[PDB]
Symmetry: C3
């Protein structure tokens, strides 16, 4: 939730999430779900979004209904912010543990500093069980195993209640006497010195000394109880390993790209050159989490969110085997209610009417090439 309201061109021109898998659709409490996939950083990064020099891989959900057990970018655990390069592709994996029952829309997201949220496709996952069964065991380097759900709760309650009680006692010591009107009149009359006695001064001295001594003793006792402590671990982790992918033996030029403004579709003229890899055929156009597929060339079998999957939303004028070398100019039409449901038609309000997306080409043997396209998008009103 939160993507439909984001500018259409910003969603089109930031990060592209390609083949994704979810290990389970329905999980029990304390069971783990794995979300893997690839994300590509668009070369034409918008200028109002800072470059992903400081980026964090996040899980979009209405709260800690899951707990993120681990997250890996390129096989490396990433508990901190990371640095990503423009134009590179990265594998990502996220292992989550179920905490609260219910149906949850879970998304993979990249939070970018100086940019904001970049939400990926969301999937509905059902958690069955009771929240009381959730456990979060962690073993420390000191040899102690604790449960993070209730660890250190009683100590915090005790100390906060103790200090609150001390403050309440300090206020109530003075609250046993007339408070506001008689004291104000006495101060106005010049009898302020009569409002504080020697016993009050001794009580204040005792309160101050007891507070300081208790703080010192509590710090000493806490140090004795936990002689081994480390500061909070923070920093930006550089040197993320990107994917070394086969360059596309397929070249695609966008002649024109238009959308009818009333409109639930997008149309584009494309010149495609096959540089080998056998006769190929376009099977899918990915724009903003929406996948328009050509049923005759490719069929999704990964449980891609159906609200974002158009099984026959790709209409190519001529989708015949493009013999290696053939340069065919084709008119592709990406049509689906998701265009209007995911407010991609709101590119009419955007201060930049340019789109970007991914095209997937398959040969007879099923090998897939990914081609990256970007162009300006012209609205049609006649």
């Amino acid at each position: 939730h939160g993507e439909k309201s984001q500018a259409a061109f910003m969603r089109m021109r930031t990060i592209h999430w390609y083949d994704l898998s979810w290990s389970k659709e329905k999980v029990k409490i304390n069971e783990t779900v794995e979300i893997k996939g690839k994300f590509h950083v668009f070369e034409g990064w918008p200028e109002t979004v800072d470059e992903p020099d400081v980026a964090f891989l996040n899980v979009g959900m209405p709260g800690p209904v899951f707990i993120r057990k681990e997250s890996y970018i390129g096989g490396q655990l990433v508990p901190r912010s990371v640095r990503l390069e423009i134009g590179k592709t990265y594998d990502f994996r996220v292992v989550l543990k179920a905490r609260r029952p219910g149906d949850w829309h879970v998304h993979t997201m990249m939070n970018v500093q100086g940019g904001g949220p970049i939400i990926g496709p969301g999937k509905w996952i059902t958690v069955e069980g009771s929240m009381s069964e959730f456990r979060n065991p962690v073993t420390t380097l000191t040899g102690q195993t604790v449960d993070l759900e209730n660890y250190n709760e009683g100590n915090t309650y005790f100390w906060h209640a103790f200090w609150f009680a001390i403050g309440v006692a300090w206020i109530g010591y003075w609250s046993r006497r007339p408070i506001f009107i008689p004291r104000l009149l006495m101060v106005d009359a010049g009898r302020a010195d009569e409002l504080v006695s020697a016993t009050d001064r001794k009580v204040a001295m005792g309160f101050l000394a007891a507070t300081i001594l208790i703080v010192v003793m509590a710090m000493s006792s806490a140090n004795s109880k936990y002689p081994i402590t480390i500061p909070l671990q923070a920093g930006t982790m550089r040197g993320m390993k990107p994917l070394e992918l086969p360059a596309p033996t397929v070249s695609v030029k966008v002649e024109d790209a238009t959308y009818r403004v009333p409109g639930r579709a997008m149309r584009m003229k494309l010149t495609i050159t096959n540089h080998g890899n056998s006769p190929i055929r376009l099977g899918e156009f990915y724009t903003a989490s929406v996948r328009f597929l050509d049923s005759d060339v490719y069929k999704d079998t990964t449980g891609y969110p159906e609200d974002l999957l158009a099984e026959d939303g790709l209409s190519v004028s001529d989708n015949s085997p493009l013999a290696p070398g053939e340069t065919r100019t084709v008119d592709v039409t990406a049509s689906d209610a998701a265009w209007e449901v995911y407010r991609l038609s709101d590119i009419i309000y955007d201060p930049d009417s340019r789109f970007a997306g991914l095209l997937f080409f398959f040969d007879a043997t099923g090998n897939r090439q990914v081609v990256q396209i970007d162009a300006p998008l012209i609205p049609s009103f006649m």
Copy 2:
């Protein structure tokens, strides 16, 4: 105009504009002139100029004597700011349309954010005709063809005059009575409440209600008249395609570079190694829009501004065919009044006495290699 006053080293060390062409020297009104060429970004970019992450290709002229019909960087239209990389070469093309008659010095420039203006060579172009004949037709996506010279002029005049008249009427309603002295005396005397009557309150209420209602009705009518509107299109366009140029089979090392301070020339010792490409010969040294040529090796036939063209300003101790492999140390002398006219001799006031420029080598067949040189420049006073 405006380059002679810019620091000599800043002009030497930012952008180099090489082979340029102008389609016409004399044009009529509404006729188009094309300026094409190449620009190279110097690797040793000055630190006080921000990197050209946000750069705009501009035309330097005393105003809209021309209108910039289009501009292309690497074959791509660039109506917005673009991103350029240090050390890369780009083709540029600019098509301008003549608007005002007269002789105009036209320059191609790169405005760089956090840096300032980078002016290129200027050429004198004559426009013959009358300004009243200039037309700027534009066809909108709604099917309307308009002339940008006078489009929406009457509407703006009408609305501004209407609101100015309303304000004048509001002031003049109160201006029919004594204004300053009697009213001031009455306010001082305590008779302020007598200065505003019930009729005045009713007039003020009517003015407020009429203003609000007129604004609302005008907005509704404007929306009805123009139901299709888009916001201003802005942004920085990345992914500019640079030139893939042959690396210079010629290696040049600058041993020493000196200039006499009184002085109208510059001298340099150079070690040149030919790595193939047949016997070569130096034909031209480009510094800051100034081209020093060796008449025996090369002759300009592009109409390069004569104030910046020194046909025999390159004197090479030995400019004989440098057999592939020969490593000759030569003393080159670049001499021309342009050195003093374009204030390149003002490098003596610069906080950085280092120069950069381009050397052009030609073989027997006429093939040209471009070598890029940079060195510190030492003034000579004895």
Copy 3:
């Protein structure tokens, strides 16, 4: 001095200084000492240190006990700040001239803007002689040879004394009369106009006119005496040539890296793959200026500061010739008091417990390969 107090991980993860040489250990006054070596910029640059876009090569010493005659980065003199790229290796050379007698700990350092100091290994150098024998001759472009120790000293003294005397005379002219109490009483009584006479006004006018005229005449005389002047030369020098080094035919993966917190050592599990270059053997681990060596494989003969040299501080479970192709998992133990002396054990207070260093592999013929390792460092308390 000043490195032991710097965070251990910051010292481990910034710049690595490898093979270094000092021309002399004991020098006389006016004699020169050359310090050469290589420095590598770590790929995982810490986020709190700005990238070395503006870096200066500096000499760490308690003052001008030496004078830095020259400094070269990649064979190019670097009197100004320079730009360095992450992940590149550079040669550096520094020629210093002895000025003051005594024993001096001299370090090579890289000052990085927005980062702070990066100190390298320090060496003790003895200077014998008298400071009065030190000379700093410099020949100017005007044909004058001067000594920078005493040049322009007398002129500065004369002008400062002259202006101080003028100010003292101005104060003392008024100081001959009663100063504070009688004048205050007269001003309070309304007799302020009697405290300044016409002669005082004439004296003030003469002082003002003389000051302005003297300033103008002094400027004119200084211009006449030195008709050739240049501004201060400043700027950041880009285009530093890095080393083109053989990629390591040796691959090393860090399985685990741990240190006992009481502790004077560090332990690591490593998987090493030989990709040719004959049977190899680990001979040295460099962490933070500390070099742990395996005496049986390699011996230092460069006079590396002994406080930072552990001749037998590298213990490899199996350090037998790793036949090209062999993938052996070995347990290496780097032990030395320098770990505690140079406060590398203070990584326990660091907000980032990750280390980086260099491994040196030698074959039978003595050829050396450098492998770069980085991992998180886990403290052991049991």
